[PDB]
Design a protein around this ligand. Structure first.
Ligand SMILES: Nc1noc2ccccc12
Ligand SMILES: Nc1noc2ccccc12
Lengths: 150, 150
């Protein structure tokens, strides 16, 4: 069920790790800076996400997170179906790649404003989700989920 | 209007500080554990919130956060109208008080599961937002915002 499908994405900047969850149907994102991509960090991130949006399915970003007992435990706890993240459709991967580039671009544009990377990342989340493409990703996710509920 | 109104709430547990944002019309929440309630922590929390939901107005939890230049800067950045949190309607306070008690109750119920308070708090957010009262707070916020957009 497409309203409930999210994709994990891990990208790197400034020797640091940015973990992103993308709501596939809308392009809406949540993101966090973590010191490294561990099972425990990913598990906690998913718990936060699922408390905030109705997350039914997660396409994990790599095999380590797919295998992780801690990630599996979090998915069990939160009622998430954990799936692999293989682009059986190869255009999917280029979309994520483009988003990572966009996000890094925005991060660069706010570095006269933010002392810490985590602030810049949250500014990028804001700008990304409010950007009008015409509706924004934020508007799209709410519309999609509301239509599903009704 | 009412779709964009949030209330800040700071509560204490285990010598630690739990910062909560409540979407007043739905009862939907986001929350975080912070070491102490500073302007910088509150500012960052609001930035995260506003990137994720269309936050128009925030009723601040106390006068220190209302006064804080850092909080004011974050509200400016994110396009949030910063307001006081005075219960001109006195029933408002008791509602928040009840929610804090409920949240602490859930936190207690999951402490055989979570090593760290932050995990327990996010479990509480999940349980709170999914609880059916009949719709859940999560369903209500999406419906309210979607209706506003349309
Ligand atoms: N969750 C949201 N509904 O509408 C939005 C507009 C901008 C950002 C987030 C949202
Ligand atoms: N943002 C949400 N839409 O629906 C939900 C159901 C449960 C929790 C959160 C949400």
């Amino acid at each position: 069920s497409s309203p409930g499908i999210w994709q994990l994405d891990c990208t790197h900047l400034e020797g640091k790790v940015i973990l992103v969850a993308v709501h596939v149907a809308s392009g809406y994102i949540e993101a966090e800076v973590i010191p490294a991509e561990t099972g425990q960090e990913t598990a906690y991130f998913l718990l936060k996400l699922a408390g905030r949006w109705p997350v039914k399915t997660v396409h994990t970003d790599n095999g380590s997170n797919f295998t992780s007992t801690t990630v599996k435990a979090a998915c069990w706890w939160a009622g998430i179906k954990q799936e692999d993240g293989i682009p059986y459709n190869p255009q999917s991967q280029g979309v994520i790649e483009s988003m990572n580039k966009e996000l890094k671009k925005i991060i660069g544009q706010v570095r006269d404003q933010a002392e810490h990377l985590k602030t810049a990342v949250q500014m990028a989340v804001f700008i990304h989700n409010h950007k009008r493409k015409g509706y924004s990703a934020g508007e799209r996710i709410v519309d999609i989920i509301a239509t599903d509920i009704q």
